[PDB]
Amino acid sequence: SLSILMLHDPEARYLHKILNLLPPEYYVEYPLWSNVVFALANTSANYRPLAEWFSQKCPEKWNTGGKEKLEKLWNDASHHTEKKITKRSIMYWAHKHAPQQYKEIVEQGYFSILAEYVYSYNGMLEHYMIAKVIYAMMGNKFVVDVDSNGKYVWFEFVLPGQPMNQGEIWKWRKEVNPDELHIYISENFSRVMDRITEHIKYHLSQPHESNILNYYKKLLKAFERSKSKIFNDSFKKGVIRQAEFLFRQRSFIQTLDTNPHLLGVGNGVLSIETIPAKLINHFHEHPIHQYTHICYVPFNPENPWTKLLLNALQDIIPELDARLWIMFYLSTAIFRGLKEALMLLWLGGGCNGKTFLMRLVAMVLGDHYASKLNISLLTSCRETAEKPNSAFMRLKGRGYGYFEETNKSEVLNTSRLKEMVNPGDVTARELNQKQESFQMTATMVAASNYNFIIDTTDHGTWRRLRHYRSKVKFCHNPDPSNPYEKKEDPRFIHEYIMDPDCQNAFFSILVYFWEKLQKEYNGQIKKVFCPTIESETEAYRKSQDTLHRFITERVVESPSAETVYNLSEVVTAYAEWYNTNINVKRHIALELSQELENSVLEKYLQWSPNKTRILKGCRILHKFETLQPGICEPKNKWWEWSPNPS
Amino acid sequence: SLSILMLHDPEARYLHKILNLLPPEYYVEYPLWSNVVFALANTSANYRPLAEWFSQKCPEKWNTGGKEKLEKLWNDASHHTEKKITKRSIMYWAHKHAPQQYKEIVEQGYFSILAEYVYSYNGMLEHYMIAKVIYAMMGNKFVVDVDSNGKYVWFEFVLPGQPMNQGEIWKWRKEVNPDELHIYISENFSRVMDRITEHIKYHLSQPHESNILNYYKKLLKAFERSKSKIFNDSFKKGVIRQAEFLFRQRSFIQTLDTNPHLLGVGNG
DNA sequence: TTTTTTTTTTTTTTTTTTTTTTTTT
DNA sequence: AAAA
Numbered sequence: 001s002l003s004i005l006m007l008h009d010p011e012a013r014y015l016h017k018i019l020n021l022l023p024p025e026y027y028v029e030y031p032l033w034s035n036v037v038f039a040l041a042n043t044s045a046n047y048r049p050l051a052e053w054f055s056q057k058c059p060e061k062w063n064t065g066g067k068e069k070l071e072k073l074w075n076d077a078s079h080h081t082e083k084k085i086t087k088r089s090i091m092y093w094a095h096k097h098a099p100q101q102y103k104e105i106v107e108q109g110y111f112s113i114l115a116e117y118v119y120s121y122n123g124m125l126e127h128y129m130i131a132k133v134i135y136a137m138m139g140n141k142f143v144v145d146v147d148s149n150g151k152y153v154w155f156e157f158v159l160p161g162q163p164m165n166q167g168e169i170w171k172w173r174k175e176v177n178p179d180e181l182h183i184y185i186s187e188n189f190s191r192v193m194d195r196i197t198e199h200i201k202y203h204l205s206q207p208h209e210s211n212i213l214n215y216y217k218k219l220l221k222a223f224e225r226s227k228s229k230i231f232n233d234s235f236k237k238g239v240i241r242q243a244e245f246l247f248r249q250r251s252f253i254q255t256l257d258t259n260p261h262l263l264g265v266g267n268g269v270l271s272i273e274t275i276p277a278k279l280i281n282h283f284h285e286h287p288i289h290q291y292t293h294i295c296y297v298p299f300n301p302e303n304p305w306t307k308l309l310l311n312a313l314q315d316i317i318p319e320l321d322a323r324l325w326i327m328f329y330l331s332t333a334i335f336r337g338l339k340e341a342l343m344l345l346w347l348g349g350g351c352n353g354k355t356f357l358m359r360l361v362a363m364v365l366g367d368h369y370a371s372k373l374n375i376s377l378l379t380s381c382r383e384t385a386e387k388p389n390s391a392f393m394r395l396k397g398r399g400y401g402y403f404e405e406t407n408k409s410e411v412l413n414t415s416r417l418k419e420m421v422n423p424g425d426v427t428a429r430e431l432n433q434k435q436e437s438f439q440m441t442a443t444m445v446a447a448s449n450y451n452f453i454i455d456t457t458d459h460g461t462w463r464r465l466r467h468y469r470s471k472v473k474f475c476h477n478p479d480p481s482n483p484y485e486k487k488e489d490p491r492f493i494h495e496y497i498m499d500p501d502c503q504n505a506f507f508s509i510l511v512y513f514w515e516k517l518q519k520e521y522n523g524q525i526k527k528v529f530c531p532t533i534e535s536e537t538e539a540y541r542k543s544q545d546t547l548h549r550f551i552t553e554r555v556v557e558s559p560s561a562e563t564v565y566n567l568s569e570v571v572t573a574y575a576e577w578y579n580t581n582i583n584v585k586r587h588i589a590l591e592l593s594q595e596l597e598n599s600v601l602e603k604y605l606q607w608s609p610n611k612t613r614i615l616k617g618c619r620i621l622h623k624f625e626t627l628q629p630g631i632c633e634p635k636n637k638w639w640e641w642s643p644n645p646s
Numbered sequence: 647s648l649s650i651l652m653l654h655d656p657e658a659r660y661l662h663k664i665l666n667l668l669p670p671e672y673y674v675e676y677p678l679w680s681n682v683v684f685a686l687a688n689t690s691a692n693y694r695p696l697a698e699w700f701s702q703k704c705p706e707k708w709n710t711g712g713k714e715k716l717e718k719l720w721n722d723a724s725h726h727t728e729k730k731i732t733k734r735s736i737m738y739w740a741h742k743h744a745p746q747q748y749k750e751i752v753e754q755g756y757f758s759i760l761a762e763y764v765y766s767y768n769g770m771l772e773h774y775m776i777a778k779v780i781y782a783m784m785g786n787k788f789v790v791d792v793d794s795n796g797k798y799v800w801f802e803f804v805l806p807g808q809p810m811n812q813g814e815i816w817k818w819r820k821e822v823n824p825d826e827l828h829i830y831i832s833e834n835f836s837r838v839m840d841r842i843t844e845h846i847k848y849h850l851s852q853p854h855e856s857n858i859l860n861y862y863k864k865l866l867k868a869f870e871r872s873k874s875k876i877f878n879d880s881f882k883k884g885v886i887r888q889a890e891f892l893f894r895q896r897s898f899i900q901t902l903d904t905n906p907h908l909l910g911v912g913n914g
Numbered sequence: 915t916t917t918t919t920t921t922t923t924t925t926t927t928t929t930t931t932t933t934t935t936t937t938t939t
Numbered sequence: 940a941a942a943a
């Protein structure tokens with residue numbers, strides 16, 4: 001039904017004019033004829049005859065390649081979507097390979113549209129007809145959408161070779177007013193206007209009877225009076241008001257920045273969807289707007305900065321397995337999608353260089369994807385009633401959260417922490433607006449030289465937690481006796497972050513590590529057995545437990561004795577214990593009404609017939625009360641990751 | 647390809663005219679000449695042949711000097727990010743060393759621009775024409791940028807010889823509305839209006855065929871009717887609301903006062 | 915727990931309109 | 940000179 005499409009849509013025929021400029025080898029290329037049929041698939045569905053016409057377009061080997069081959073990709077499912085290239089991109093392949101003939105095709109294209117309107121209304125232009133001409137001419141560059149509060153917001157696609165803020169190439173940007181459209185409607189639209197002027201004068205040159213003696217003269221007078229209308233301001237404001245509907249595109253704002261496999265970079269957009277990661281520095285159709293100003297380059301260990309960073313980094317963390325495991329964890333900061341609930345906190349001392357690593361990642365990732373949050377938030381000690389809260393926000397879309405030191409060692413209640421790590425959704429509010437929910441997908445790190453008090457026993461609480469301790473410390477007198485001591489550079493933090501190449505080198509390392517973990521056991525973090533890690537963590541679990549310490553301080557090593565009333569004094573005995581052993585405090589005592597049974601006291605803990613859980617015997621201690629009776633060091637390179645054991 | 651240089655771009659031919667009347671002693675010297683090479687290189691990369699011809703202004707340096715070194719300098723300036731010294735500076739040296747000649751050159755330039763618009767639209771001026779003509783002159787001052795709050799903001803370059811605040815000289819200042827731009831467009835633009843009127847009446851003086859019996863009469867009537875528009879409040883407000891698009895400079899507010907090696911003082 | 919966020923603006927007209935002199939009756 |  002080629003004729004059908006021809007008559008059904010003049011644009012379809014124009015679209016046919018433009019597709020005739022494609023060389024036959026384009027139709028030969030297997031992934032390309034799949035691309036074009038998919039591109040037309042997402043734009044309407046009645047173009048099956050046109051798609052079938054494309055099967056007969058340069059069919060030098062259609063029978064050789066299979067008659068039921070190109071149509072099969074569309075006839076198998078006229079429904080269904082793939083989130084692929086739509087229209088307004090086929091024009092890009094058309095003009096990138098067939099110049100000149102493309103510019104005249106579009107030139108006569110809107111020329112017919114404009115010349116139709118000038119004849120139909122005796123040369124009396126208006127706002128809407130101009131808006132239609134503009135959209136058919138530069139409708140493949142602008143998108144208008146409506147935000148949450150509701151205004152007609154303008155988004156512009158940046159192209160190389162035009163004034164633009166650094167790092168904002170090959171991606172959409174927000175515009176308060178389409179300013180460059182205002183100059184565009186005044187300069188390039190004039191050229192279209194002139195072609196009309198020549199056409200009417202040429203027809204006036206050809207003699208004829210009264211049908212042209214006054215009719216052409218009237219239009220010329222009307223047209224010239226209307227020629228100056230375009231330069232007016234209120235008229236130009238009206239055209240922008242009209243064109244808002246033509247450039248309207250439903251479902252564009254909420255699909256912005258949704259793909260977690262696309263990252264905006266200073267030299268295009270970086271795709272981590274497939275291995276290896278690929279850089280896009282040409283036209284595409286992915287709705288991405290946020291970015292960071294760090295240019296991406298392929299990972300080269302031969303760069304002096306890459307070696308410089310790797311050497312200092314390797315010295316910072318001595319253990320090979322710990323070094324691999326930590327950076328693999330930090331490599332997830334590039335990802336912006338759902339992540340497994342892992343909390344990383346680790347201990348150090350003095351000028352340990354902890355601040356250097358967090359600071360490096362934050363600027364490398366950029367503000368759009370990384371941010372600094374109040375350390376108090378981690379404590380979770382603070383509670384928020386029905387009141388605005390801002391620091392809870394800012395976590396949207398981010399993939400990295402880093403903290404700093406506290407006043408001292410701090411206690412962290414499970415509340416306000418369970419939802420900070422879990423792959424769930426949380427809701428809150430702040431200045432203005434109201435309650436709203438947002439998916440949390442950011443990696444979390446918080447290291448300090450202060451131990452974090454944890455008062456619980458639940459496995460679910462102590463399953464999304466990992467602990468580490470630093471061992472290498474920096475001092476200005478590095479005696480050559482202790483390996484855990486190295487010299488410092490004041491420039492190392494004050495500068496070396498201001499060098500863009502350092503960020504470019506560091507970002508490459510992060511990309512490479514994420515590729516390694518992805519090429520590793522299908523992602524995930526639970527694997528990679530680092531004996532140094534997860535052992536100090538459970539050692540920290542054997543510590544940081546007041547009850548267990550109390551158990552093997554007063555009742556254990558003296559269980560054969562018998563000074564027991566009930567669960568009541570055991571709490572008081574535990575109360576006075578932590579009062580001195582730790583600090584004086586009180587609790588709604590029901591926690592031990594079951595935790596004590598959850599403990600190892602069952603040897604003597606047996607509930608009496610009238611409940612009271614009378615322990616079979618212990619010795620409450622007063623006065624001194626003693627004598628109571630009861631890895632491979634890497635050869636030369638470790639970023640190469642070594643074989644599977646590593 | 648000098649003909650290609652002078653063909654595709656009237657801005658290039660204007661830069662050709664400005665490139666003349668220069669003190670070639672500076673071109674002979676390495677520092678200042680390299681500085682102006684950097685200035686022109688930072689202003690787009692499409693002007694590679696024009697920069698090459700700038701190497702052939704007083705060709706002695708291109709015949710006695712680092713030819714390949716100079717072209718490599720221009721190339722690296724094109725593909726590097728620096729402080730980005732731009733135009734409106736070579737204009738400064740041209741005015742500094744060479745008064746007179748440049749004044750009538752720019753006068754003829756924007757006068758020709760306005761005359762071209764008048765002849766194109768039968769002397770029916772409109773806000774865009776006046777806005778572009780105004781941007782053709784001035785331009786050095788009046789940088790416009792969009793704040794973080796979404797409000798257009800105007801900035802003026804303070805110069806000696808005006809009523810300014812204390813210690814505000816030789817640096818940008820914030821302006822709620824370009825008031826002295828308003829009075830400038832009211833006063834100085836009238837000189838161009840008068841020059842155009844004189845040119846029209848002079849052409850009317852010369853005798854010709856039936857064109858002058860009615861056609862110049864129509865042109866002069868339309869121009870006279872449009873003359874009073876520049877004094878209208880709504881017309882001038884529209885002219886400003888059109889012109890702030892042209893004087894827009896991307897990435898200006900956030901890069902303001904960023905340099906820690908520069909201090910603002912009373913005497914500069 | 916006010917406190918400051920909330921309130922409460924806050925743009926608020928503006929364009930235009932009319933005419934528009936010329937034109938052409 | 941008056942109406943569009």
Ligand SMILES: Nc1ncnc2c1ncn2[C@@H]1O[C@H](COP(=O)(O)OP(=O)(O)OP(O)(O)=S)[C@@H](O)[C@H]1O
Pocket residue numbers: 311312313315316348349350351352353354355356405474487488489490491492493
């Ligand atoms: N890999 C490295 N190479 C060279 N110098 C380093 C390295 N790591 C740390 N340093 C030096 O040691 C210092 C870093 O320690 P600090 O940042 O002071 O300690 P921190 O644990 O990060 O937290 P602070 O700052 O002590 S509260 C810097 O002054 C660096 O000069």
Ligand SMILES: [Mg+2]
Pocket residue numbers: 351352353354355356
């Ligand atoms: Mg530090």
